[PDB]
């Protein structure tokens, strides 16, 4: 019925199961952007709508865990809670970042090339990737590669300037705070 999240505040909730049509559509829309769809064929998928003081948020829950969201580009992205639940191996790529970059990303910055200390997986410009703090492998941001993985390998090694990854969702953003609270309530 309602939750109260940090930053976002009071949210009035409505939840429902995805229809069979909605489920098939979701799977079709995920397939091109990820190595694997992380959840089981038998997972329970629900759509949660949360209305706060500023507007409406929509999250797809996977067995109750707030995992997926539609962005303004019309593509479906994982929450950081999804990456905790399912790991990161199912993404096309991961970018490892230094401490200064991890902190900046947690504040809401895009990821710049000099903050990159490694690249895992193979991906092209435009692909969905996650940025992880190298030391602990903590996911801090989910976003869109601005360069190919092979290009980024040479660019970070020379500490070239420019944007490596365009941020879509990050640790401590409004969606993150909402997802935290949905997860807390599930517990
Ligand atoms: K799967």
**Residues 178 and 164 reside in one and the same domain:** no
- Residue 51, domain extent: 1-88+172-187
**Residues 11 and 81 reside in one and the same domain:** yes
The separation between CA 177 and the C-alpha centre of its own chain, rounded to angstroms, equals 13
The H-assigned helical ranges of 37-161 are 80-86, 99-106, 149-157
**Residues 110 and 66 reside in one and the same domain:** no
Q: Which residues sit with Cβ closer than 5 angstroms to ligand 1, an ion?
A: 37
β 128-133/93-97 pair status: parallel
Cβ neighbours, 10 Å, residue 153:
13
Tell me the C-alpha distance between 17 and 133, whole Å.
Answer: 35
Taking the centre of ligand 1 as the mean of its atom positions, its distance from the CA of residue 120, in whole angstroms, is: 20
Taking the centre of ligand 1 as the mean of its atom positions, its distance from the CA of residue 18, in whole angstroms, is: 17
Taking the centre of ligand 1 as the mean of its atom positions, its distance from the CA of residue 48, in whole angstroms, is: 21
**Residues 134 and 186 reside in one and the same domain:** no
Tell me the C-alpha distance between 89 and 37, whole Å.
Answer: 10
Taking the centre of ligand 1 as the mean of its atom positions, its distance from the CA of residue 84, in whole angstroms, is: 16
**113, 131 contact by CB (below 8 A):** no
Domain CATH number, residue 147: 2.30.130.10
**Residues 33 and 100 reside in one and the same domain:** no
**5, 183 contact by CB (below 8 A):** no
Domain count, the chain: 2
Taking the centre of ligand 1 as the mean of its atom positions, its distance from the CA of residue 166, in whole angstroms, is: 26
Taking the centre of ligand 1 as the mean of its atom positions, its distance from the CA of residue 53, in whole angstroms, is: 36
* Cα distances (angstroms) measured from residue 29 to each of 46, 58, 68, 178: 16, 16, 12, 24
**105, 167 contact by CB (below 8 A):** yes
**Residues 58 and 112 reside in one and the same domain:** no
Taking the centre of ligand 1 as the mean of its atom positions, its distance from the CA of residue 39, in whole angstroms, is: 4
Taking the centre of ligand 1 as the mean of its atom positions, its distance from the CA of residue 106, in whole angstroms, is: 29
**Residues 1 and 50 reside in one and the same domain:** yes
The H-assigned helical ranges of 56-148 are 80-86, 99-106
Cβ partners under 8 Å of residue 35, min gap 6: 89, 90, 91, 92, 121
**Residues 96 and 18 reside in one and the same domain:** no
**Residues 125 and 148 reside in one and the same domain:** yes
**Residues 60 and 102 reside in one and the same domain:** no
**69, 58 contact by CB (below 8 A):** yes
**Residues 162 and 186 reside in one and the same domain:** no
**Residues 178 and 118 reside in one and the same domain:** no
Domain CATH number, residue 56: 3.10.450.120
């Amino acid at each position: 019925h309602m939750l109260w999240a940090r930053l976002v505040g009071l949210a009035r909730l409505e939840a429902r199961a995805l229809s069979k049509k909605e489920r098939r559509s979701l799977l079709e829309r995920l397939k091109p952007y990820y190595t694997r769809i992380p959840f089981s064929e038998k997972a329970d998928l629900r759509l949660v709508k949360a209305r706060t003081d500023s507007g409406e948020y929509e999250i797809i829950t996977v067995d109750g865990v707030p995992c997926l969201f539609e962005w303004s580009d019309g593509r479906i992205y994982p929450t950081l809670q999804c990456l905790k639940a399912f790991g990161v191996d199912w993404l096309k790529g991961v970018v490892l970042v230094d401490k200064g970059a991890a902190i900046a990303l947690a504040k809401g910055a895009h990821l710049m090339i000099p903050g990159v200390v490694g690249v895992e997986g193979s991906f092209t410009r435009g692909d969905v990737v996650a940025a992880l703090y190298h030391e602990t492998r903590t996911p801090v941001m989910v976003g869109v590669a601005e360069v190919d993985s092979s290009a980024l390998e040479k660019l970070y090694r020379e500490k070239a300037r420019g944007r490596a990854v365009r941020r879509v969702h990050r640790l401590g953003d409004a969606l993150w705070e909402l997802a935290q609270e949905v997860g807390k309530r599930l517990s």
